[PDB]
Design a binder for this molecule. Structure first.
Ligand SMILES: Cc1ncc(COP(=O)(O)O)c(CN)c1O
Ligand SMILES: Cc1ncc(COP(=O)(O)O)c(CN)c1O
Lengths: 449, 452
């Protein structure tokens, strides 16, 4: 059977390999709209849009035709040694012109992980170029997600991404997760929470030596780490501290990018003025692996100078700007703009968040959080103590399993279940997502008993 | 114009960004078979198959239809949390069953760089799982190429990949480039050279502490480093040293994989029995970004053990095993098998090397090297000293420029002019590749004026 071949031959990411050898896979055969189907023909709402990525859903014919047209023209070429091609150029133009702050240049990669890894190298290269060889350290946040390379997983602030991998590397620093529900002191306002986080950052910088700190990287809101909306005034006050010590602000838009948070970019939603932006996922609705780094004039000018001094920029991937990946992403962004999906997603997000808010007084519901068309419901064993049932993750695992039984694919992030549907979700589809959440919660409530 | 937008908006890899603002791009518009065409309609033989990658050439309709059929079925899904899909499973099966040594599991990534970076993490994870927490250092070679992440560029042994990037990281060690022509002692045999490299490796291991050395990684034949064929008995003697100290052997097959070297794998051509193999490029003819790690039973078993103890394996990329990329790769490997392209490439490789060897006593030709359908001509200013004409790289750059003028895209690696055509290259086309090399060499010879 296909399931036995999978057990025999594939090591799965983010999977217990031994449990996999026992249970085998859930094989997804096909998709259309917001739905995927297993090999038994059971349909599921992809409430996660795959990996917070499939913006236009699973059967957008314009993307499929854009791939075909590029395949039949030039199915592969590269950008090395002055070589170029139309889809990379037209995508780079569109990305610079739609950027929420003035940007200079695009550098393409296959993945968000490769992109953040590349940003680390580019910042090191830049500060070497500027004669600041000590200005190399990165500050990220607890529960931040920035990818899985040796360097990008050091940026990542999830313990499950570091345990057993001897990470983080030296020079990769973490300050606090900006999650009021978990980290605010008794009675502390959002603004006062934001103050204390800005202080933590300033004190980390002073303790490490400001001359040693190159960059601060953050997702506008934290996706994979639990759909963590920062408190009011966090980004304003954090940026003041960064500008104070000449620290680059990197906006990781891998999940927030292209209409997830109620505006085109999380940088717009949260008032971020980044030096560097990292884009992926909704860039192509994940129909092709592609990510993009936007760098502003000063970062480009320094890198360009050093690329001349050292002969050439000694960096690039075979797939960097792949013509099929760039052609699909270009068409994807045109569809998001032509179909006004940023504003449609904002409207569907209000319906999603209002539907979930009906459960705010459920005895297992600790917090309902969200922004735009991304949300999470964090379950707890006790609302007063905020303590888990048995152990962190026990409720989330059971909930995600029940959701699947009820025909919905969600992702458990500890004891939070996430919602990140395709931007094309309609009103009754949002209603069905909340209904399947409600069934899963009912089952979880009877289970905890 | 398209060229002005390119200059305005794109930072190019492996490009002098200032020179790019001055000269602008060469824009490639379309391709078919072994040919690409610029936006002025000038045709070029892609003698490099893009980046040593486009095995089936630029218009294979079977790959384009395999992509369409997968797009119209399931255009994205992932492999996280037990999720799977048919193309990843059937590709994983094909890869394990064609492996040159017994392999256990496939792990998919988007790129060779991500794959080698992932191998680093998996080896660290494995030795932690086995209770050998000191056994973490990697040994690679000077002029090796393994990618551009912070970790994979530390494995890479080219200075241009490290200079200005604060690389390599600690724990990433380099031993000698196995290039007889450049690094042998005057009058040393290939076998004696192989002995001395094996001694250097043993002495590095002993000097560092054998208990601290996890892995040795090598391309069977070095691609980006200049098509460097190792000396006879190198891989035998290096592996003996590795097995002596319980050091994993990683075969980087990103270029050698799928018929480039005269057999399906460089591991077969060079008698390597690796613990881990890394595959990309010809896997999909670069029609889709995909790479694959093959791990043997012992590597899998230790990772699997720790993945249970820690709840799950905390690693993976969004695109890992992308259904369109895996579907295209699966069809690509079927075509290579059905069209006997490993055998055809071996035949075309003999014709290519014979054609170039007409120039073996040229005053600027220092060495003609390769095997299967990968070759390089290393030009020198002086055959006795092996010294370059003007700065190292001058002849390579001039040759690559002339080749382009004569309708051929080749890559210079210093003064080595490389050949890595699509596997589908025919006998006449090999003839035209060598003809355009000959015109470039004639131009370069008139430019230098060797006299003598
Ligand atoms: C915010 C964020 N940043 C970076 C990454 C890394 O992406 P990739 O999986 O494409 O390597 C992810 C992926 N979940 C992400 O969510
Ligand atoms: C031998 C080898 N290893 C690894 C890589 C890295 O591949 P990628 O560009 O897909 O990251 C390359 C790419 N030229 C390679 O040639």
């Amino acid at each position: 059977s296909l399931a036995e071949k999978d057990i025999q031959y594939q090591l799965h990411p983010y999977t217990n390999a031994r449990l996999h050898q026992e249970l085998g896979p859930l094989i997804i055969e096909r998709g259309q709209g917001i739905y995927v189907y297993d090999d038994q023909g059971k349909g599921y709402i992809e409430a996660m849009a795959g990996l917070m990525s499939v913006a236009l859903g699973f059967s957008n014919q314009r993307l499929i035709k854009a791939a075909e047209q590029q395949f039949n023209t030039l199915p592969f070429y590269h950008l090395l040694n002055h070589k170029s091609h139309r889809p990379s150029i037209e995508l780079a133009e569109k990305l610079i012109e739609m950027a929420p702050v003035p940007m200079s240049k695009v550098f393409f990669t296959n993945s968000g992980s490769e992109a953040n890894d590349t940003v680390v190298k580019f910042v090191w290269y830049l500060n070497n170029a500027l004669g600041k060889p000590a200005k190399k350290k990165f500050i990220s946040r607890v529960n931040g997600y920035h990818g899985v390379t040796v360097a990008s997983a050091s940026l990542t602030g999830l313990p499950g991404n570091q345990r057993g991998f001897d990470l983080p590397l030296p020079g990769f620093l973490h300050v606090g997760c900006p999650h009021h529900y978990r980290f605010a002191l008794a009675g502390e306002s959002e603004e006062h929470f934001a103050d204390r986080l800005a202080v933590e950052l300033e004190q980390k910088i002073l303790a490490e030596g400001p001359e040693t700190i190159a960059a601060f990287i953050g997702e506008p809101l934290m996706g994979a780490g639990g759909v963590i909306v920062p408190p009011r005034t966090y980004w304003e006050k954090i940026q003041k501290v960064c500008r104070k010590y000449d620290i680059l602000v990197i906006a990781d838009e891998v999940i927030c990018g292209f209409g997830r948070t109620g505006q085109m970019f999380g940088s717009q939603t949260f008032g971020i003025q980044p030096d560097i932006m990292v884009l992926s996922k909704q860039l192509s609705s994940s129909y092709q692996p592609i990510a993009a780094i936007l760098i502003n004039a000063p970062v480009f000018e320094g890198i360009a100078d050093q690329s001349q001094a050292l002969g050439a920029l000694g960096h690039g991937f075979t797939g960097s700007g792949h013509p099929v990946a760039t052609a699909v992403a270009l068409e994807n962004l045109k569809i998001i703009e032509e179909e006004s999906l940023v504003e449609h997603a904002a409207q569907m997000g209000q319906l999603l968040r209002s539907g979930l808010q009906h459960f705010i007084d459920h005895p297992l519901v600790g917090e309902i959080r969200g922004c735009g068309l991304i949300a999470a419901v964090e379950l707890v064993g006790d609302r007063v103590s905020k303590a888990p049932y048995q152990a962190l993750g026990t409720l989330g695992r059971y909930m995600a399993g029940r959701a699947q039984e009820h025909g919905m694919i969600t992702l458990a992030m500890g004891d939070a279940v996430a919602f990140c549907p395709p931007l094309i979700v309609n009103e009754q589809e949002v209603g069905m997502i909340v209904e399947r959440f409600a069934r899963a919660l009912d089952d979880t409530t009877q289970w905890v008993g």
